[PDB]
């Protein structure tokens, strides 16, 4: 995996981002919009739960992720 040594989150917007969630799932997709409260809008969001064995996988598309239920953000891949 490769990414630029970025200063802040908004500078790397529209990047394929692995986004953890407090309930155990991880949402992977290119981020369109962020917030002061860390609400995120993934362009091609993909629902990936970790069941109690192997990864659960599901496609969502354009979705809002609420900020409170986020654990953290990670860059998965580049734009385009």
């Amino acid at each position: 995996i490769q990414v630029a040594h970025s200063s802040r989150l908004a500078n790397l917007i529209d990047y394929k981002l692995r986004v953890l969630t407090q309930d155990g799932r991880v949402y992977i997709g290119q981020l369109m919009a962020f917030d002061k409260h860390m609400n995120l809008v993934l362009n091609e969001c993909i629902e990936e739960r970790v069941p109690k064995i192997k990864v659960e996988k599901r496609v969502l598309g354009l979705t809002i992720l609420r900020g409170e239920q986020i654990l953290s953000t990670v860059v998965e891949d580049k734009p385009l």
């Binding site: 969630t21 309930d23 917030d35 609400n39 809008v41 362009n43 598309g61 979705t63 809002i64 609420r66």
Partner: protein
């Protein structure tokens, strides 16, 4: 103002899905949204965390409980971003 909350209120009317902290998904026409995501739906299917589906006419939700909201592919186009 919150640009994701901007998107939510712009998404009113479409068949949107919604899972909470509880893990119980929903899916139907949205009706109302605010700064705190005080969501309302119509024609909402209410699948419990086990998978027990219960069709119902309406629902109101509090924003603290909301986890994520499935928006359609129309809001990808216009006009909130640029």
């Amino acid at each position: 103002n919150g640009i994701p909350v901007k998107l939510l209120n712009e998404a009113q009317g479409h068949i949107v899905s919604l899972e909470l902290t509880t893990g119980a998904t929903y899916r139907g026409k949205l009706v109302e949204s605010e700064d705190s995501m005080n969501v309302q739906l119509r024609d909402v299917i209410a699948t419990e965390p086990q998978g027990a589906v219960t069709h119902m006419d309406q629902i109101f939700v509090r924003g603290s409980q909301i986890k994520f909201i499935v928006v359609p592919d129309l809001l990808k186009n216009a006009p909130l971003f640029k």
